[PDB]
Amino acid sequence: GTSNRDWWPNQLDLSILHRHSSLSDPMGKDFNYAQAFEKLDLAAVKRDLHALMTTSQDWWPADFGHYGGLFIRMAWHSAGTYRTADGRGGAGEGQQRFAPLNSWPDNANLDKARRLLWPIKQKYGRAISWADLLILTGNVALESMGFKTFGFAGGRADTWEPEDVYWGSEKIWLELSGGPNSRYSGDRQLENPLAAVQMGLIYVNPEGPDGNPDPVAAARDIRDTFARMAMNDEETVALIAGGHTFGKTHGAGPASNVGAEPEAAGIEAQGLGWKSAYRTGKGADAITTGLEVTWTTTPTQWSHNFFENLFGYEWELTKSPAGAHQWVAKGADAVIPDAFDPSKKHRPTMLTTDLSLRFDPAYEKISRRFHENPEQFADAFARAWFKLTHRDMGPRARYLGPEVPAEVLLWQDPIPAVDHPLIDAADAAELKAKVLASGLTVSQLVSTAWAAASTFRGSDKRGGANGARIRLAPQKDWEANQPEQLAAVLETLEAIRTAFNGAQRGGKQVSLADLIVLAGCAGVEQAAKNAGHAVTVPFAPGRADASQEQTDVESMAVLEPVADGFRNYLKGKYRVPAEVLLVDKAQLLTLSAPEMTVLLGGLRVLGANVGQSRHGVFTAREQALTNDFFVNLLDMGTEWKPTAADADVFEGRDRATGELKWTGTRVDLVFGSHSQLRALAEVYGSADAQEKFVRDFVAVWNKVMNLDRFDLA
Amino acid sequence: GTSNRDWWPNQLDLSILHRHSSLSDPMGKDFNYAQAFEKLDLAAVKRDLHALMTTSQDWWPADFGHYGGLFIRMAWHSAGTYRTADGRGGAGEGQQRFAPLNSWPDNANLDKARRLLWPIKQKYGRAISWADLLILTGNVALESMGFKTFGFAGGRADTWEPEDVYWGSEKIWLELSGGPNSRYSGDRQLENPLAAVQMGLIYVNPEGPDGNPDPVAAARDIRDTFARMAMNDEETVALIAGGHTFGKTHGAGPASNVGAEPEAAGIEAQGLGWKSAYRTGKGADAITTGLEVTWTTTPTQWSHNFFENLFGYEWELTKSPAGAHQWVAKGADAVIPDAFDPSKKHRPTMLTTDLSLRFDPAYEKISRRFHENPEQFADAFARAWFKLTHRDMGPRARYLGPEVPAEVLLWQDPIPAVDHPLIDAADAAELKAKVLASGLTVSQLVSTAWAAASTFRGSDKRGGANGARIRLAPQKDWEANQPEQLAAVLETLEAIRTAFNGAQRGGKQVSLADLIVLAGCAGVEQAAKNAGHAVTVPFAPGRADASQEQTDVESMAVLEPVADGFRNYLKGKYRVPAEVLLVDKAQLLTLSAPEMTVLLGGLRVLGANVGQSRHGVFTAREQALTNDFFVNLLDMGTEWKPTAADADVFEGRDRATGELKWTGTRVDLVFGSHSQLRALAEVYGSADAQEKFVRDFVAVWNKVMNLDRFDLA
Ligand code: HEM
Ligand code: HEM
Ligand code: NA
Ligand code: NA
Structure with a gap:
């Protein structure tokens, strides 16, 4: 079925202002999540989560008998979409359960993790949101494995449809840089507002930049992407080394064994994906990313083994069973436990991006300080994990429950x-x-x-x-x-x-x-x-x-x-048309299309333009609150044309005489051009x-x- | 920006159930259109419209000094999108002013007609909707030119965004039949629910089928498409001959002179389109369709001259100045007035589709009766024009104002x-x-x-x-x-x-x-x-x-x-997946996704299925109103597989034992598969x-x- 988007693919999309209406929401219009959460027995939820950790299901058996590593990864992916550029992504809306993020390749098998939480979600109902549950489960996983967290706040209300986020323009999953829709230009400059190196990845490529296994160049990408998620060097080293204290990767066989992601799978798959034809398809035969790395000698317990191994061995480049680049410790004994077979042990292994912590000079100094002072590492990781999981929640007044840190x-x-x-x-x-x-x-x-x-x-x-x-x-x-x-x-x-x-x-x-x-x-x-x-x-x-x-x-x-656009301001010239930037800002302000329309028309007449610009000031009584902006914009007695000097400025001239009446920008004139915006302007420009x-x-x-x-x- | 529709183009689209929210509507939540209209001074509106008809604007000069013809076509295209198969399209929501209809090739220059009505819309404000105004203006046009209409009802509330309608699958405007997305199969069978022969046309091609100028073949398309808009032979002849009693077509020069339709035009065009570089671009030089036909000797007056000319002359195949096929009266005098030059006259002309009214044998008998008895023609046309313009309004209880017909x-x-x-x-x-x-x-x-x-x-x-x-x-x-x-x-x-x-x-x-x-x-x-x-x-x-x-x-x-889907019923096997048909039904019933979800789950356990089918009846207490459908559907202890006999039926078996618990269809299981629907199912499947x-x-x-x-x- 051909759609308006097909016929006119560059026309502005106003439906992003009308998401999250009461129509799509199953809860009543007065449902208040904060009040439901305040009555949740949070201690009971946490006891259930502690039980779950070691209750292995046969359809996705727990590595080492303990789902903790999988749930920590689940929570860190939930939070890890965040971009400081726009504030979009992050854990705060539970968007991991919707398209596209439910099916991003970096979220492979996190469908299984969310399904393992269904019985708890079902038990407690509306009093704990999915959004809150994903983060609480990550906290419980850490605690179950001996790490004391800094705290936890609830209050992330669930959402009911996909958030409208620009994730990039590539039309191929995981496309490498330099393609027709490259997110990189110049000296590896990532375009704003993006915060990941490839479409469908959280932050960086675990094999190295565009797949090239150089830890020093990988460090550059880690630093850039993490800074774009609001994290500095200390926080970044603490997070990566803290996370990779636990669990393992999955690459037991070739990736071509792995089938359709959830949004593409058949209806019988009941919301799950990446079904694998490799041996049993799961547990010891799991394939998630294709890497086969287990970092520590106790993957289900907090330890200081990550940095002992990082510093204590020299590393050799090798390949996983799926063909991915990864590193193995030169000369080491088989000291790492197998996730399923008590009679097997393995040599220490690392990702390229793990070695960045040692081979980037600035990271190396922090890694070494954490190695020598593991108490500092513990505290830094706890603080960073709190920040990571709460960075998109807002002011402290929104924080709910009995575990909120007082600091x-x-x-x-x-x-x-x-x-x-x-x-x-x-x-x-x-x-x-x-x-x-x-x-x-x-x-x-x-x-x-x-x-x-x-x-x-x-x-x-x-x-x-x-x-x-x-x-x-x-x-x-x-x-x-x-x-x-x-x-x-x-x-x-x-x-x-x-x-x-x-x-x-x-x-x-x-x-x-x-x-x-x-x-x-x-x-x-x-x-x-x-x-x-x-x-x-x-x-x-x-x-x-x-x-x-x-x-x-x-x-x-x-x-x-x-x-x-509400002040007719553009700091420079951008590839994005200014009216698209207006709608983006309106979305951040939580405005509907009628609200954005009224607001802009009023600000123009009140003299809110930067620099006292006359563009869009379509009134002869500036500083008086009238609907003049609309009545003049819609006057067919005026004809508009782009200026010679500037295609983004328009002159409005009397049709009969040619005399100049007004000037406007694209933000001003879109309200007389876009067929849904002009419908709104007509309401406010009417005589009544x-x-x-x-x-x-x-x-x-x-x-x-x-x-x-x-x-x- | 790549979107979910890009990544997963055949996934179901729920946004069609969440249009028309209070967010997108500029009127308050308590706005009642009927109450505003009932106080409109309708007689005063009609006096303003009557004046407008002969007050030519220089940006779109009136043919013959009278906009009547143009407004009749405007009001006919407003109504003429209607399809009986789903009831979608028609005049009842004013959708001509939104995409895609505002930029269909068949609606070329109706942008100018709508803009001519702005001053009156502006004067009367919320008391008359665009939707009603369009129709009223076509009635007033008729009246101003001596035709007595059957009546008029107000009450069409305005809408604020595009309706979601399947208009066809072609990716090229006006594509001829037999392409990769052909709307025709077999012996010229038009696919349901479509009611037009080419993408972007109201009914048929005025040159003839896929441009072939044979009035007999054109008659077949006319009959088929009009029947699909719920009009029979009598009504069809009355409408076409009645309409073409007035006005003219526009084709003064080559079509390549004509620029971008409104949705594609630049921002400076302020909602208008089809700007023409041919001579003055308007008036005597107007190009709309590329045809150049003026049907009667008094284009601004009701007459029975369309049928006098149709039957009084023999017709020759000719070409307009833009190259379109059309017909001219053999041997005739120059008796038709020119639209701008009082000293010039023209021979009678006809469209291929006009001659259908004479050369199809069933049409010919009706046309002859109307020719001989023009009082019958006037009455048929009045009745048909009312039907055309009110067919999608609903029950007579919705009809407002003082001109509603009592019959x-x-x-x-x-x-x-x-x-x-x-x-x-x-x-x-x-x-x-x-x-x-x-x-x-x-x-x-x-x-x-x-x-x-x-x-x-x-x-x-x-x-x-x-x-x-x-x-x-x-x-x-x-x-x-x-x-x-x-x-x-x-x-x-x-x-x-x-x-x-x-x-x-x-x-x-x-x-x-x-x-x-x-x-x-x-x-x-x-x-x-x-x-x-x-x-x-x-x-x-x-x-x-x-x-x-x-x-x-x-x-x-x-x-x-x-x-x-609410009764798990499919009369036969269709191209369209059953889940898509469910959402289509939900849309027709005006249900949100949450409403559709609740309703379906409840009907299943109440015993509403056709034939007492057990598909989707996931309860051990049928005829009791519980949430069992959702609790059982979401139970991960059950595994679902398509049956051998039928890919569209699924068996749900205990995962551990293999025992058969349930069967369901695609309609049942979509609620556990689609990510937005399963999120809704979870709400109702929770313990609370x-x-x-x-x-x-x-x-x-x-x-x-x-x-x-x-x-x-
Ligand atoms: C440069 C940043 C990072 C990179 C490139 C990265 C890469 C990966 C990869 C490739 C996997 C394997 C997935 C699989 O095949 O199952 C993974 C696993 C995991 N990561 Fe990271 N990681 C990053 C940072 C994080 C951070 C910040 C955390 C948490 C604080 C984290 C915690 C985890 C954990 C716990 C697992 C184990 C999953 C399991 O046991 O099932 N990592 N990481
Ligand atoms: C088989 C059905 C029909 C065909 C193929 C058809 C075709 C057309 C075409 C090609 C034009 C010229 C557009 C332009 O170049 O400006 C037009 C004009 C017009 N048609 Fe039709 N028509 C049909 C039915 C109707 C009906 C049902 C009505 C109303 C009752 C209507 C009323 C008019 C009027 C008034 C004009 C003249 C517009 C003007 O004066 O600017 N037609 N028709
Ligand atoms: Na966010
Ligand atoms: Na309709």
Whole structure:
């Protein structure tokens, strides 16, 4: 059946804004996962998980009699799709159970692992999500095998359909670099927002870059991909060596024995895949990646054997039974146990990427420190495992249950506790009047609050206006934020704040974070008044101000908007059309198509454009909250053409006279071009819609101002 | 970006069940179109439309100074996508303004027609939908040119994204028959559910079949395609000759002058397309189809000149300026006016498909009668035009406004008025107890009510339990409905009804339509009771019984279910996998994926299968309402394999012993195979889900029972 995507493959896809509707969700519309989880008997779940570890099923027998290694890998793949670039991927939505990730080649046989958890999921029902279960099982596996974890938070709500993520443009699974859709260019530069080296891999190729077994070049890829998942050198060595303290790989025979991945298998396979014709197809005959490596002399117990073996032997290049490159210890005795046959033992083996930990010079120093000080290694790995499994969860207010660590970590972008009475409605009125009396304009007030709040992304729940981090490095210097104008607005706001706070009793005070947001609300109210409408914009206090020492400047850099269509901003020229970038940003902000439409039309007229650009400012009453953007955009009395100087700027001219009426970008004009967007614009550009526009604008404005308000959730 | 559809192109698509969410809709959740329309000043809209007809815009100058012809074609293409096989397409959702229909080659330049209506749409806002406006404008065009229409009903609510319709499998616009994706097989047999001869055409090719200009052969395609839009010979002749009484075609120069259709055009074109480099690109130089035919001597006035010309001249095969085949009157004078130059005149011209009306022998008799009796032609055309434009609107209860015709037409599947007091809640409880005391089983009661209510399709709002047409030809003889079992149930229910109705005072009585549904409600309540649960199933009386004389048997044939996954039924063996047919049925019933899942699992254990098949009946307590279907389907202790006899039937065996536990079809087992469906099955198969399962089953049962209840809307 031919589809619109077939006929017009480069037209914008708005269905990504309408996912995760109440239609696809089986739970009622008021189902609150947090409340279900809070009543879960978590200790009972953990006892069941401990039992499962050694309860081998005949359809996928447990290596060494213990599924721990398989479940740790399962949990690390669950978390390991995360990209700091957009916040997308990670464990936080349980997306491993859906396409495509359920069938990625790197997730081979993790279908079996998830199926082993069905009876526990079934027993506890809606009170523990799959997303939470996958991570808890990884924690229990570690604990079962003698490693004490740093803690665990629940609260990852399950999702019910595939997340829309750009994973790459290759049309062949695992395609090597330099093809027609290469994710690499130049000096091995991986394209943003990707965080893996080949389509269908978590991070890197275990044989080495594009299959070439050089540990030093492999180290480069490990470092690049791990940095793109938010992990530095210490955390990376701790994670890889910690993980490979346990379990084994599977490559007992040739890969051509292995059949269709789950999404391609027959209906009789009942959701499972990679069925293998090699001998029994499982256990001692398992084939998962094709590598055949067992790292330690006690694969089911925490030990310090990974680094003893790494440093204690010299390594020779060899091949697994499936033909994959891997390394064997020169001259070693057969000291590694077999996973099924008590009378067999094996020499120590390593992956190319394991040897990176020794042969990359920066990794070697950390590996050596961990080898000499195994207590440091233990603590680093525990902390890293917590980070890995919680990095996409959001602020600490979302963390549920009795195992949440009390230590506050820099990567969590922590927000101080509020310790004082908050402002009330009479105080908010007084502060709004002070803000309007100072001379700050509608444009300044709206632009600053937008700049503060629109850093939020729902993908990893980072960003937003809580914290007042717009006043700190690096946000205060971002070009999209207009540093000189920002400084002057913040200075005026801080004077108002200081005066209000100095006048209070009883410890009451207002944060700068709250005041920025409140000042934006005063500007929207003033804009409505300018248009002859009486509007009150809702405001919820309770934001606190974070310090510079609580704000990791390099981790903050991914939140920098390089494209923000809501302010008609593009930092440079990109291969992706700007309207595709707008929809991407709308998705991160959790906006539907109607919300994105209303919001953008209103911001244009309020003067939220960066640099005071006139592009899309289709009104003769700037700083008044009207639907002018829509009524003018849709006026057939105007004809639009790309400019000579710039194909991405358009001039709109009177059809009868040729006189210039307006200019716009692709972000402005897409609302008059895309047939679903123009349908939405027509609603707001109708003669009966001025009041609807104002009230829908105030709603969406308020929504954006509260995106990060998990303390009120 | 590579997507799941790319990787797994034959996996089932559930997103078709989750369109039309509250996320995509710009109107509030409480917006009621009918309430907005009922306050529209319809007479004022029609006066504005009447003015528009002769107010030419210079960006698309009006032929003959009158847009009438253009708007009639606009309104005919809006309705002309309709297929009786599934009820999909038609005018009832305004889908012409979305992809793909906005850019079909047959809809070329209707973009300009819609843009001409923006100022009126803008003036009246949400009180008149695009969908209604399209049709109204074609009525006003006709009226302005002297034709008295049969009437008009408003009430077509606007939609906000493209409908998912199978329009064919060709990958090239207008591909000629016999390609790799041919819609034709055998002796020119058009595949169901298609109703057009080439991808991107409304009905037929105006040159002739695959471009061959033979009016006799073209007649065959006209007859076949019109029949597939539910029009007979009389109606077809009336429509084509009536339409071609007005206006002209456009082919002033070569088609290679014409640029990209709207979905492919640049952003600057602002939703318009087919921009032409031929001379001025418009007006006298317009190119739309490439044909250049003007049918009558007064193209802006109703007349009987189409048939005077058709029968008064002999016709010669010729070519337009773009090279298309067309016909010119042999030896004629220049009597047809030019569309822009008052000093120029032209000979009569015709399409191949016009001459079909004279050269097909059955058409010729009707055309002759209409020629000799133009009052009959006018009446036929008026009636047909109403039918064409209202055929997908549904029951007469949905018809709004002051111009609704009072005559009740057989194609409307009319339902008589209710003239008596309805049963109350106490009466409903007494009838449910009498039904259960009769000895009718849960299975019989559920199966009968399902068979009555599940003929509904939301595509054209035909079918449903209102009317009690299950007791009439042809529904009573459909194989899916189990004619002998149905007859015995209906006999028992009619005895109950007769006894109840004979006992009442005050004229109160119960229809058989209401009692079939209520009997099904009693069956579901009893099934819940069998499982240890007391529930009330909601029931809304007010259905009435239609007669056989009010039921067009041939028109009812398309409602026959030949695939009903909810009863595990397939009338024969099809190209399309059964699971795809299930999702198609779910879509027609307006069900979400969660609704379809609950509903199916419940029907299986209630005994709803045709023929008492045990396939998918995964319970040891049939006729009790439990979640057994899901608990047993998801049990990994069972292994499933296709049977030797039949690849589409599967045996479920104990994994350890080999014992045969169950059998199922593809429809049953897809719920354990598809990753999004199995996630839903898991919810209902959880240990905490029994109450949720029953609640959700009763809600969807009730939803189905009320699909056609537009009298309560
Ligand atoms: C450079 C990064 C890494 C590479 C290339 C990589 C590669 C692999 C490969 C190829 C397998 C074998 C899969 C099979 O054939 O069954 C595997 C297994 C595993 N990895 Fe990693 N690994 C990486 C990092 C991680 C990290 C961060 C963790 C966890 C903290 C982890 C924990 C595991 C465990 C536990 C197994 C054993 C699975 C079993 O016993 O069934 N690895 N790794
Ligand atoms: C076999 C069925 C039909 C065929 C093949 C057909 C074909 C066409 C073609 C090729 C055009 C010229 C489009 C252009 O170049 O501008 C057209 C114009 C038109 N058709 Fe049809 N037609 C059919 C049925 C109908 C029906 C059922 C109606 C309405 C009752 C309709 C009303 C019109 C009108 C009013 C125009 C003139 C548009 C204008 O003035 O701009 N036709 N027809
Ligand atoms: Na994420
Ligand atoms: Na329809």
